[PDB]
Structure formats: C-alpha cells, structure tokens
Amino acid sequence: KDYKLTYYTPEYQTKDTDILAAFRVTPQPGVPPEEAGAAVAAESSTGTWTTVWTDGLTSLDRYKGRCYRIERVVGEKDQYIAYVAYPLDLFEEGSVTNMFTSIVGNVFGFKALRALRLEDLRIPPAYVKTFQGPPHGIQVERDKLNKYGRPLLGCTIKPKLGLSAKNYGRAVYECLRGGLDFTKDDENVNSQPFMRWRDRFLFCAEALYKAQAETGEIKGHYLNATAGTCEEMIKRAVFARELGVPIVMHDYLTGGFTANTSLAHYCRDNGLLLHIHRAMHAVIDRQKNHGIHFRVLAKALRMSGGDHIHSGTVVGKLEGERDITLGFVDLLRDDFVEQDRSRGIYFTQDWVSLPGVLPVASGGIHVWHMPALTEIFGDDSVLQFGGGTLGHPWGNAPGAVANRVALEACVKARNEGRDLAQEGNEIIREACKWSPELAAACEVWKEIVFNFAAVDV
Amino acid sequence: KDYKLTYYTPEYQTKDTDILAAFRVTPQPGVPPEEAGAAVAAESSTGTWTTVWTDGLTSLDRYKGRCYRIERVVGEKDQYIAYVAYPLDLFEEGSVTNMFTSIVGNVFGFKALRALRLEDLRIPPAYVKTFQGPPHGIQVERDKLNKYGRPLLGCTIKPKLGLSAKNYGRAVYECLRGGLDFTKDDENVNSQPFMRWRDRFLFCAEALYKAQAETGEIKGHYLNATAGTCEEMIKRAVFARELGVPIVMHDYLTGGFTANTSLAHYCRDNGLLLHIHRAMHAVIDRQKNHGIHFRVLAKALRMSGGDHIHSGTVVGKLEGERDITLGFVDLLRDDFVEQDRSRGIYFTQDWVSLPGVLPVASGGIHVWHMPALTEIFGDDSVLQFGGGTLGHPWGNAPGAVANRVALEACVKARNEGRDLAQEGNEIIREACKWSPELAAACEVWKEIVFNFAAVDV
Amino acid sequence: MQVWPPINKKKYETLSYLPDLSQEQLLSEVEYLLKNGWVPCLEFETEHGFVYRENNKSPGYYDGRYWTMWKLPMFGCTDATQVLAEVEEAKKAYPQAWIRIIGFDNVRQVQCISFIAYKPEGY
Amino acid sequence: MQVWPPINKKKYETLSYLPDLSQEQLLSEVEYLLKNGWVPCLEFETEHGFVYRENNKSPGYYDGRYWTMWKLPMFGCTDATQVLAEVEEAKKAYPQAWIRIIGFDNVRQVQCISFIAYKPEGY
C-alpha cells in the first residue's frame, strides 16, 4: 500500500477549520519519512490500503487526513515530526472521546513505525465552540471564592488510603483552619470498606464549615466523585450539591472523557467547581518516543471540562523541562497562545474565550520553594503541599500557617519590587522572625543553606 | 433413593468459595447417619431420588451439596452433626432470601428425619463481598453520634400498644432528657387506630429535639418503619429523612429479608441508622432439636443489613448459655471469629471488613445488673431498659438518670482497675450516695442484698 | 421525690453524670488509656460547647462535633502525668474553654475514649 | 510547640497573615497596582466583616462577599498618595469599619488585587 502518493500532500494549504496534528514519528528501517507520515494520516482517517467499490459512493479526498509536512528532528536520527490535517467533518461536536478515537485510535499500532508520539494538536475555533469547557474557569472561580492577588493554597490528607471518615474530616478542619484554601481527597479515595463516600462527604462538610466560620475565609475540600459507573458518579455530586459545598473532584483519565464531560456539564448546571486529578497520565505521557504528551491531554481536559488540573511540579527541573511546563500552563490558562517550538508549542492555539483552567502544582513542595513557585507560576495557580503541612513538627494547623505566611511574604516582597529569584532564601529568613510556625518548618533548611540560625533582635 | 453413594463424600476437601452448613440431625429409627446426612445435602441442592434425562445436559457433580462429614453428638444419642458443602454458584449475589431458600427451603420436611436444626453457616469471603451489610456499623455510628467509651443506653416506651402519638412523644422526651441515648418504638407499633405512624414520627421528632437541646447530647428514637408493603415501608423512612432524625427501625423476620435489604440500602443512601428487632425469632430458634439457631439468623441480618440487633439478655443464664450468646455477639461485632465449638461456633468466619452490628441487650434488666452487663458485653453494646426507667418511683427522667449514673459508675470503676465481677454490688452502693435517683431505684434491692441501708456521712 | 432540672444540667458524654473527677481520678482514667495502648490526645473548644445544626439538617449531620486539637496526639507517651500537665497548660491559656481527653485505638483507626477534663465557670 | 488560636484570628484574605502593614508598606502595595496599570478602588464594610449564608446555601452562594464602594474607582490616578489619602478620610468618617483596597485589570474585566488597609478596634 503506497500511501505516499495519496496521503502525503506537501502542497496542501491548511484550512481555518482543520484539526492539525504534530506526530513524532520513528519509522521502521527502510521506511521513508514521506511514506511513514502518509501511513499516519491514512490510518487515522479513511484507512485504506487500496480501493473498494464503496469509496466511489463518496469523495475520498473530502474525509482524508493529509500529511502536509515532514521535519527531521535536530537531535536524534530516525525521528521526524509529521504534520497531519484532518477535516472538521470527521469529528462529532462536543466529543473529546470521538476526537481521540479518530486521531489516536489505530495509528500507534501500525507496523511501518517503531514508535509514535502525538506532541500537539491545533483545535480550530469552529470545533472549540462546540464544547462547554470548564464549568467556571479562573476568573469566575476567584469571584465565587472572593480570593485575589495570590496563588491559592491546598494540602493533601495523608495517608493516601487508610483513614476513617471522621479522622479524615479532623485533618481537613486542622489544615483549613490554619490558612489553606483547599484540602484534597486522595485520587484513590472513592468509596471503600474503611471509608464509604457518603460518610466522608458528610464529615468533610462539617469540618470545612467550622474552619470557614473560625477564619472568616471561604474554604473548600475536593470531594472525589470518581466511581464505577456514571450513575454513581452523578449520585455523589448530587449529595455535594445538597450539602452546599463549593467543589468536587474527578480522575478524568481513569474515569474517562465520556464520564468527565457528564460531570463537567452537571457542575456548570449546579454551580460546583471541578478539580481534576491526572492519575494514570505517566503510562501515556512519560516516554519521549511513544505515547501522547501531556500538553494534548491538558488541551483535552480544558475542552471536556475542569476548573483545576494537576500539572506536576517545577522543583528540581532543568530550564528545558521547565519551559515545556510553562508551555502547557499557558495553553491551559491563556486565550491565545502563539506557536513556539522552544516551549513545545507546535501550533498557534486560539481558545475563543473558552474559560481558562487553574494549574495545580504538587510534588515535594516545601516552604523554601515558595519564592520560586510564586515567580514561575504567578498568581493564577494552586500550590499543593503534602508533608509540608502534615509533616510540620507542630501538626496540621501550624503547618498550614507556615505555608500561608511563607506565601504572603513572597507576594509582599514581589509587590515591593524584590527579585524572588535571587532574594528567595532571604525572604523566608526574614519571615521566620515574625512566625514561630514558619521558623519551626525551616529548621533543617536553615542549618544547610544558612549554616544556622537563628534570630537576633 | 440411596443418596449415601452420591451425596455422602467424606473424601471431599472444602473450597474457599463453598458455603458450609452444620446441621444437627435426628434421623428416623433405622436410617443410618451417612444416609441421613446425604439426604440433607441432596434435598437442599439438586434434590433427585434417581435420574432424568435433563441431568445429562449439565454436570450434577458441579451443583450438588455434599455431606463431607458426620459427627456424633456427645450428649444425646440419635443426634448427629452433618457438615454440608454448597457450591458458590448455587446462590444469587446479595440475596439472603435465596440463601435461605436453597439451604432451609425443603430439608426440614424430609421424612427420613425426625428433627433437623441448622446450627451454623460458613459464609465465604467471595459471597460476603456481594452484600452491602450494615448501613453504617459500630465505628461509623459512634462517630456520627459522637459517643465513645461506654455502652449506649436505651429504654422502651410502655405499654407496648395503646398510647396516643402525643403521649408517646411525652414519654420519649422525659426518658431522653434524663441521660438515655435512645428510646424505642414497640415492635408492634406501626400504624393503628390509636396512633397513626405519621403523627408518631412528628411528635417523637419534636420530643427528641427538645431533649437534645436541653442536654447537649445527641439523641435518637427508633421510629418503626415496618409495614404491610415495601412501598409503605419506604414511604415511612422517607418522612424520617425529611425530619432529619438519626435512626429508624424494622422487624426483619416478620417484615422479611427482601424488604429488610431494601430498607438497609435506603438507609445507607440516606444516612439513617437502622435498628433491628428480632420479633418472631423464638418460633424458629428455641427448640434444641428443630429449627434454626439464632447465630444463623444473626449472620443473615448482618449480611442483609442492620446497625443494631436485639440479642436477648445474659441475666440469669448459666455460663453454658452465656457462652453461646458471647459466641454470636462476636460473630456480629468482629471481623474474624475463629472456630470454637465450646461457644457454638462450628466454623471460622471471616467477614472481610463487612461492618459490625451493635448488639442490643434487653429483658428484665435493672440497675443492679449494670456491673455484670458492662463486663460481659463491653463498650460496644446497647443496654435497653423497660421497667428500670418507666417503673422508677419518680418517673421517666429520674429513672433514666439512675441508669445513666449506674452505668458511668461501672465504667469509671472498671477503668480504675476494679473487678466488676466481685465488686459489682459495692460499686452501685457507693453510687447511691451521690445520686438520690439511683438510691430510690435501689430500695428493694438494698433491703435484700445489703439487708439495709442507707447512707452515712 | 425530686424533679430533674430542665436547665443548667448540660452534659459532655461519658462520665459527665458523675461528680467532677478529682485530679487523682482524672489521672487513673489516663492510665487506662496507656495500659490498653491507646494514644491520648487533648481537644478544647471556646465557642460551641454543645452540638447544633446550622449548615444542614439531613440525617446524621450536626455541627459542633469537632473540637480543636491541642497540639498533637501523644504517641509513645508512657507517663500519665505528661498528659495531666497539658490539661493544666491548656486551661491556663484558655480558662473559658471546655477541655476533653480523647483516646485513639490503631487496630482500628478509632477513637475509643472521650471524657471532659475541664469545664469553664458556670458549667 | 505552640497551639494556633481558634479565636480572635479572623482573616481578610491576601496579606492578612503578615503583621499589619506600615504606612510605607501600604504605599508600596498601591504603587504595584499603578505600575501594572491597575485601577485602584476602595471598599468598606461596617456590619458583616466576614462571609455568612443567610439567603441561600446552594453551591457557590455566600452573603457578605460584596462590600460598599468608597466613592469611585480611581481611573487615571498616577500618585499612590492620592489613594492613601482616601483611606485616611474613610476611617475618619467610619472608624468602626473594615477598609480594603482593590485593583481592577481592563484586559480582563477583573479584579486582581484585594488587601485590607484598615481594621476596627479589636480586630
């Protein structure tokens, strides 16, 4: 089957309504780039080795994917970037499920290729308008919560699996009362023998309302609605609505796009914020040669629907990887993101006012990382801590206070014109003076970085 | 029909997925034990005297019950214990109704037997997982009610049948305000000319909320939802949910397992605690030679669903009978109960985290019985009084206070290292000094046991 | 015949119907926790000393069940006096607060003890 | 080890966990707004200083989010002292009121700043 002479069209001028795809192709030895890129386009559209009579009862050239360009990858050899264009008509309106089925449904198993990786997708404005997108989005969320001028703060309740409903609520209250905005249900925590969902929702609501009453600030707890069936999932969200809480949670990849879109629609119709966890993403997005890059999985979530989405951590990453992260963070928050291959952005993406998603940074984050995080992500982000709150010597509340004080010290310093990049450690040092909670959290750090301590007067 | 050569299989090695049954068989004269035990297994599974053509369109040896062991009873002669094994496939998932139909459906009427009694059943983990079990269970219940470190206290409103809705509520308020946690609808009290259900639910809710507001402790009243049809039963529970009360009640044996499982499911989905009354049990479980022992009826309730279950009284029982009671109490509360023939436990029962049920002790219980009850049952129990509260000289509230003071005196003494078994009477004596209510309840008792009275200073 | 008071008789669950525990009795209770291997912990409350229902009235929901934790659960504690010391420190900092001692069991992720240790003036 | 107070620690969002801003620091914050092209505006409240839920309890609904505007947004304001002057005038007229400075962004129809500038006695 010589696809090259039908699916490889370098003269093709892409239309405003086309869905464009950037594939990183690693063809089998002997297989030319043009033929590999044509095999990719062919398999993900009409998929024909030759011709059958039914192909005459329509126009093949109307519904075919077209490889219009090939580019050799600067680094490794035997690796190319194939650009494919898909007609708007191939896709069902409002269905991320159909978009993924058409583009990544069968091509990754083609024999002529050794490895295949979808790097990016250009979602045209005409297809974007068929999606509801985030239930609320960054702006509406800040307005509902009445929180402005700083990153939001959250913490994970540990251990992951194991705690009872009442103990879970206790940790929720202690963390929230200390200065945190949100607490989190573990992604694995749904409904189990040690803790059934309804009891958890009930005690967590009691805990979050107490902390809100005590502090005077609006609180929220991501109540996991992920379930075995769509009916159970909705049944769980319905109870969150009855309790009057602000936010629910969902594991979009393990739950699935069909179920996630249903929940997102429900959340829009009922005023619930939707926190998304990316569990299982690394089985798909880790290897550089095979799979789907997270930036595509992030675009899919923004279309399907979610107000927050876990987007990893930037701590301990080479600029390089950091640039890739900032690349997809922009794709999630901004309305218009211009093409920029240096940050892994293969296409200019126009979101035509689709609400932006709040990126959630988590993973080994400590108070002394606050300066760098505040500078890198900016205000529109949610910074989540695990052992930085639970692992504080004095407990949850003092641990939450330490993180809240550290963050506000960074915000104040930034606003006063200080460079968070070079004065970071000093900013935390000064803050330790007026915060016993922050000081106790910085002990081991002071000994290594400052070779001491202390205070003076 | 010679079952013995097909249903009596002493070489059979039981599987982890088998439902095991321990039958106490009293065969007709002349009928051998092996043949009797094989008749029991045959009748409660495939039930064939000989063979018909349809038996070849399947494998008889795949769905047959097997008597794998016989044991002569030490005491009486002509009495044996037959052990039968049933394949997991014979049973419908989540249906206690089907389990009872298959095992006890026809065998008790077999002619070759003079009497038959089901003593125990080994419910394998694979079948246990198909049941929801108690709506909440011991732990969640204590957490919802915020009650720890002592047995719970309840009282019955008397007379059984006869009082009006408002008078019923009055007794409810007086008892609850005095220190009791729960009050009880009589098992016979459903909806009658003298008192319709809705009026009772309405006045009892008013009474329990007043007592809760007055005392500062969470109160509950078992509102009987037992009814003629499933629709009426649910309709009654729905109103309890609208009133926001914590607990409802059901007579599982007269109402039935199909209806009880429906109510239990409803209670889980709506956060209602379910109190179970064992009315009619003695027509089934009293005779040692024929029927079903309560330990099996208790296992069935824990599977079908219930948070509390009446399990009789231990007062005035020989160790012997007391050991049998502690045997089924463990089967109701614990996760793993090892085999122990001395306490009537024929099989090791693994409950694989199915919630435990709170045993309810009632029947001629007086304040001076408190020491023995607290020691025998422990904290995880509900102690119910009838005339010990209503029959108090000063009325309901002072009667409730006497029982609450007596119980707390026993708990304190136990915690301080005192032996409730030998110091019981003295503990109540000391308590009478600081409680006029307790003193008045102990008058006739003081005269007999202590040959007096009084106080000193 | 006496009438049980409908006012000024607010309770705090287990042991609250007995006369106020003397320091010696309070100490014996803590030793029961330790002897059983239970982890002691202190909780206190300054505003709502009793349950109420402001945010929801569905079955099983009540506000005021959770109190605020005093420091952290005392793991590895072997001396019951260490626990008694914290109660003194707590009422020293918050004299107008209700203080209670709770116990946690690990075989069971549960709480299995809860008794009042200090009550504010007029309670 | 210290216990975080369950009372008298009411907050007002951004910057409220830091020591009360000195007039100099308060002025630096206003200059951040101006440097970014944000329109400053003052809001004050005399009765409900914190959110509550009286009219509805559905998801996302809270009473007390809106405060009353002090005059008008300060468009074209180039001097941060003009803003600081208004805070003095506001607390002069309403000493028992909480006063906060908010900032508005135009590229985005949004508010993007909100910090407390004055708190009444005992707060």
Do B and D count as touching (3 or more CB pairs closer than 8 A)? no
Whether B281 contacts B294, CB under 8 Å: yes
Q: CB contact, 8 Å: A398 with chain C?
A: no
Q: What CA–CA distance (Å, rounded) separates B275 from B357?
A: 10
Residues of C in contact with D1 (CB under 8 A): 71-72
CA-nearest residue to B417 within chain C is: C32
Whether C41 contacts C105, CB under 8 Å: no
Q: What CA–CA distance (Å, rounded) separates B164 from B197?
A: 10
Two structure tokens written together for C37: 């291997």
Q: CB contact, 8 Å: A355 with chain D?
A: no
Contact criterion met (CB < 8 Å) for D6 and C68: yes
Positions at the binding site of B for substrate: 106, 156, 160, 278, 310, 362
Residues of B in contact with C57 (CB under 8 A): 244
Whether B175 contacts B212, CB under 8 Å: no
CA-nearest residue to A236 within chain B is: B269
Whether A20 contacts A83, CB under 8 Å: yes
Q: What CA–CA distance (Å, rounded) separates A90 from A84?
A: 14
Close Cβ partners of D10 (under 8 Å, ≥ 6 residues apart): A215, A216, D49, D50, D123
- Calculate how close chain A gets to C2, using CA atoms only, in Å: 39
Contact criterion met (CB < 8 Å) for B140 and A193: no
DSSP B141-177: HHHHHT--SS-EEEEE-SSSS---HHHHHHHHHHHHH
Q: Which residues of A are part of the catalytic machinery? A: 158, 277
Q: Which amino acid does the sequence have at D56?
A: N
> What b/e readout covers C66-86, taking b as 16+ CB neighbours within 10 angstroms?
bbbbbbbebeebeebeebeeb
Collapsing DSSP to helix, strand or coil, C25 comes out as helix
Q: Which residues of B are part of the catalytic machinery? A: 158, 277
Q: What CA–CA distance (Å, rounded) separates A221 from A242?
A: 15
Collapsing DSSP to helix, strand or coil, A277 comes out as strand
- DSSP state for residue C58 in the 8-state scheme: S
Using alpha carbons, list the distances in angstroms from residue A211 to B54, C67, D10.
69, 11, 11
Q: What CA–CA distance (Å, rounded) separates B173 from B167?
A: 10
> Which helix H or strand E contains B43, and what residues bound it?
helix B33-43
Which among A107, A185, A170, A138 has a CA at the least distance from the CA of A358? A138
Phi first, then psi: give them for residue B362, nearest 5 degrees: -150, 150
What angle in degrees, to the nearest 10, is found between the helix axes of B396-415 and B420-433?
A: 130
Phi first, then psi: give them for residue B233, nearest 5 degrees: -55, -45
Q: CB contact, 8 Å: C13 with chain B?
A: yes
Phi first, then psi: give them for residue B276, nearest 5 degrees: -105, 130
Q: Is A381 annotated as a binding residue?
A: no
- The alpha helices in B228-310, defined as continuous H runs, are 230-243, 252-255, 257-270, 282-285, 294-304
Largest CA distance in chain A: 90
Residues of B in contact with C103 (CB under 8 A): 149
Q: What CA–CA distance (Å, rounded) separates A20 from B170?
A: 75
Collapsing DSSP to helix, strand or coil, D71 comes out as coil
Close Cβ partners of A364 (under 8 Å, ≥ 6 residues apart): A313, A315, A316
Q: What CA–CA distance (Å, rounded) separates A102 from A194?
A: 41
Do A and D count as touching (3 or more CB pairs closer than 8 A)? yes
Q: CB contact, 8 Å: B149 with chain C?
A: yes
Experimental method: X-ray
Which among B425, B402, B401 has a CA at the least distance from the CA of B413? B425
Q: What CA–CA distance (Å, rounded) separates C114 from A299?
A: 51
Do C and D count as touching (3 or more CB pairs closer than 8 A)? yes
- Calculate how close chain C gets to D48, using CA atoms only, in Å: 18
Q: CB contact, 8 Å: C58 with chain A?
A: yes
Q: What CA–CA distance (Å, rounded) separates B272 from B264?
A: 9
Residues of C in contact with D51 (CB under 8 A): none
Contact criterion met (CB < 8 Å) for C70 and D3: yes
Q: Is A304 annotated as a binding residue?
A: no
Q: What CA–CA distance (Å, rounded) separates A184 from B4?
A: 62
Q: Can you say whether residue D105 is alpha, beta or left, with left for phi > 0 and alpha for psi between -120 and 50 degrees? A: beta
- Calculate how close chain A gets to B173, using CA atoms only, in Å: 27
Q: What CA–CA distance (Å, rounded) separates A304 from A101?
A: 15
Nearest to A216 among D1, D50, D115 (CB): D50
Which among A116, A25, A7 has a CA at the least distance from the CA of A78? A25
On the CB side of A237, CA atoms within 13 Å amount to 29
Two structure tokens written together for B68: 């794998």
CA-nearest residue to A405 within chain D is: D17
Whether A366 contacts A399, CB under 8 Å: no
Size of interface A-D (CB pairs under 8 A): 112
Size of interface C-D (CB pairs under 8 A): 14
Question: What count of other Cβ atoms lies within 10 Å of the Cβ of residue D92?
Answer: 8
Burial of B209 (0-12, 13-18, 19+ CB in 10 A): middle
Contact criterion met (CB < 8 Å) for C71 and A395: yes
Q: Which residues of D touch C (CB under 8 A)?
A: 1, 3, 6-7, 53, 57
Residue pointed to by tokens 């231990």: B314
Question: What count of other Cβ atoms lies within 10 Å of the Cβ of residue A7?
Answer: 26
Q: Which chains touch A (3 or more CB pairs under 8 A)?
A: B, C, D
Largest CA distance in chain B: 90
CA-nearest residue to A201 within chain B is: B271
Close Cβ partners of B22 (under 8 Å, ≥ 6 residues apart): B81, B82, B83, B118, B119, B120, B121, B346, B347
Q: CB contact, 8 Å: A410 with chain D?
A: no
Pairing of strands B152-156, C110-118: unpaired
Q: What CA–CA distance (Å, rounded) separates A374 from B294?
A: 65
Which among A286, A215, A227 has a CA at the least distance from the CA of A254? A227
Whether A377 contacts A359, CB under 8 Å: yes
Close Cβ partners of A112 (under 8 Å, ≥ 6 residues apart): A27, A28, A31, A35, A36, A39
Question: What count of other Cβ atoms lies within 10 Å of the Cβ of residue A342?
Answer: 9
Q: CB contact, 8 Å: B273 with chain C?
A: yes
Q: What CA–CA distance (Å, rounded) separates A419 from A371?
A: 9
Q: CB contact, 8 Å: C81 with chain A?
A: no
Q: Based on C-alpha coordinates, what's the Rg of chain C?
A: 16
Residue of D7, D9, D51 best to disrupt the C interface, most CBs of C under 10 A: D7
Residue of A163, A183, A203, A210 best to disrupt the C interface, most CBs of C under 10 A: A210
On the CB side of B38, CA atoms within 13 Å amount to 17
Q: What CA–CA distance (Å, rounded) separates A260 from A256?
A: 6
DSSP B110-122: -TTEEEEEEEEEE
- Calculate how close chain B gets to A110, using CA atoms only, in Å: 42
Residues of C in contact with A177 (CB under 8 A): 68
- The alpha helices in B65-124, defined as continuous H runs, are 96-104
Nearest to D14 among A272, A397, A411 (CB): A411
Residues of A in contact with C63 (CB under 8 A): 206, 209-210
Q: Show the CA angle centred on residue A73, arms to residues A17 and A49, nearest 5°.
A: 60
Phi first, then psi: give them for residue C4, nearest 5 degrees: -70, 125
Q: What CA–CA distance (Å, rounded) separates B279 from B264?
A: 18
Q: Is A51 annotated as a binding residue?
A: no
Residues of B in contact with A164 (CB under 8 A): 139-140, 143
Residues of A in contact with D111 (CB under 8 A): 142-143, 148
Q: What CA–CA distance (Å, rounded) separates B189 from B171?
A: 15
> Which helix H or strand E contains A201, and what residues bound it?
helix A197-215
Q: What CA–CA distance (Å, rounded) separates C15 from D82?
A: 63
Q: Can the peptide bond before residue A29 be classed as cis, meaning omega within 30 degrees of 0?
A: no
Q: CB contact, 8 Å: D107 with chain A?
A: no
DSSP B428-454: HHHHHHS-HHHHHHTHHHHHHHTS---
Fold exhibited by the domain D1-123: Ribulose 1,5 Bisphosphate Carboxylase/Oxygenase (3.30.190)
Residue of B143, B146, B218 best to disrupt the A interface, most CBs of A under 10 A: B143
- Calculate how close chain A gets to C25, using CA atoms only, in Å: 28
Positions at the binding site of B for Mg(2+): 184, 186-187
Question: What count of other Cβ atoms lies within 10 Å of the Cβ of residue C1?
Answer: 8
> Which helix H or strand E contains B63, and what residues bound it?
helix B60-63
Q: What is the set of domains in chain A, with CATH numbers?
A: 5-131 (3.30.70.150), 132-450 (3.20.20.110)
Two structure tokens written together for B109: 């009427």
Q: Show the CA angle centred on residue A257, arms to residues A65 and A186, nearest 5°.
A: 140
Nearest to A245 among D9, D59, D115 (CB): D59
Q: What CA–CA distance (Å, rounded) separates A80 from A68?
A: 13
Q: What CA–CA distance (Å, rounded) separates A111 from A108?
A: 9
Q: What CA–CA distance (Å, rounded) separates A188 from A254?
A: 10
Resolution (Å units): 2.5
Q: What CA–CA distance (Å, rounded) separates C21 from C117?
A: 8
> What b/e readout covers B292-319, taking b as 16+ CB neighbours within 10 angstroms?
bbbbbbbbbbbbbbbbbbbbbbbeeeee
Two structure tokens written together for B213: 């507001």
Using alpha carbons, list the distances in angstroms from residue B8 to A126, A392, B5, B115, B313.
75, 65, 6, 19, 39
Two structure tokens written together for C80: 């019951």
Q: Is A310 annotated as a binding residue?
A: yes
Q: What CA–CA distance (Å, rounded) separates A400 from B82?
A: 63
Q: What CA–CA distance (Å, rounded) separates C15 from C115?
A: 6
How many Å from the N-terminal Cα to the C-terminal Cα in chain C? 25
- The sheet with strand B291-292 has its strands ordered as B66-72, B80-86, B19-27, B113-122, B291-292
Q: What CA–CA distance (Å, rounded) separates A410 from A434?
A: 14
